[PDB]
Structure 1
Amino acid sequence: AMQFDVTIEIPKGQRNKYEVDHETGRVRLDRYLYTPMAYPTDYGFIEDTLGDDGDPLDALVLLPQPVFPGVLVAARPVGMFRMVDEHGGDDKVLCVPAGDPRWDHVQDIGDVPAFELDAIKHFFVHYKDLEPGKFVKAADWVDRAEAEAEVQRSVERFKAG
């Protein structure tokens, strides 16, 4: 079973959008969101990846309690939120904590309730609504196999460097 380290940038419940400078590893405030919205899960990126858009591959991690920005979480994928924004491809791997038996019933995208998946989708569809020249189109859920392959190829691209 695949697993990897996610650096969490943004705790669940946050309207401050934090990024990491990937040169330094410093956490940065990107912006306070222009919409009255809050990240619906802990959000970050997979360490040692180069995604389909030239940045590290983004990840959403389901947690019982949020963490702080910059914290590492060992995670395994169960699906992916596929999307294109003004930046091009901007896919998000849905994960759960690896090696934690309390998540053993969550193996694939169909094991995550529709209410959670719709909520996550709603966030990404709408959070940029009041920023002009920023859209999102092609927004879909895909299964674990598709998530694994995208992580796989983004690990290879990182190594080719």
Structure 2
Amino acid sequence: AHPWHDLEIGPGAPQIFNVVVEITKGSKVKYELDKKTGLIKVDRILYSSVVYPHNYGFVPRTLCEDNDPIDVLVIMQEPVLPGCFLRARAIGLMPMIDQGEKDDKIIAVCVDDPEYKHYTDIKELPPHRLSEIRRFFEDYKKNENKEVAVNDFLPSESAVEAIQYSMDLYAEYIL
């Protein structure tokens, strides 16, 4: 199964959905799905002594304006390996700009993680968590001389609307 096209989004979408992990919490390696093959590839090694703050990946059968599936950061107890998928609930949305292009990220929790599965909104999180996440995306390409502006987080309903829209775009631009 191709993890973008063949894996189902999950019956509970857009509220709950599968996430294919590309990058493990704590990693300096920026892995990405290779869209053509469905394999995981090294896009690059980060140019700063920084690491992804949480597991990170994408939602199957979604599509954004950047021609990628929608991105998700998944808060949970444990590191998850690239290429594996998990079930997640959207709890907030982080709008941002990467060199003039929209690049919004979903903030989610794993619904099968007994510690985090009961979160439904990012306002429930310790605020430092949000501060660290925002700072990561403002920092992680600085040493590539690439400009990343991050805006204020939005609530879970904004995230759910983003997911739904990306489902629609995928369904439209398929065949």
Given the two structures, how large is their TM-score scaled by the length of structure 2?
Answer: 0.86
Distance in 2, Cα, partners of 1:138 & 1:93 = 13
Across the aligned residues of Structure 1 and Structure 2, the Cα RMSD in angstroms comes to: 1.4
Distance in 2, Cα, partners of 1:92 & 1:18 = 16
State the secondary structure of the residue aligned to 2:144: coil
Going from structure 1 to structure 2, the CA distance change for 1:100 and 1:42 (only over 3 Å counts) comes to closer
Q: Which runs of 4+ in 1 moved over 6 A?
A: none
Partner of 1:75: 88
Displacement of 1:87 in angstroms is: 6.0
State the secondary structure of the residue aligned to 1:8: strand
Question: Which consecutive unaligned segments of at least 5 residues does structure 1 have?
Answer: none
Displacement of 1:53 in angstroms is: 2.5
Distance in 2, Cα, partners of 1:42 & 1:30 = 16
Distance in 2, Cα, partners of 1:139 & 1:69 = 28
State the secondary structure of the residue aligned to 1:102: coil
Identity of aligned residues (%): 38
Cα shift readout 1:29-58 (whole Å, capped 9, x = no counterpart): 011111010000001111110023321100
Structure whose residues are more often strand by fraction: 1
1:88 lines up with 2:106 in the alignment: no
Q: 2:67 aligns with which of 18, 42, 54?
A: 54
Q: What is the identity, as a one-letter code, of the residue corresponding to 1:11?
A: T
Partner of 2:143: 130
Partner of 1:150: 162
Given the two structures, how large is their TM-score scaled by the length of structure 1?
Answer: 0.93
Question: Which consecutive unaligned segments of at least 5 residues does structure 2 have?
Answer: 1-11
**Equivalent residues, number:** 160
Q: What is the identity, as a one-letter code, of the residue corresponding to 1:151?
A: I
Q: What is the identity, as a one-letter code, of the residue corresponding to 1:64?
A: Q
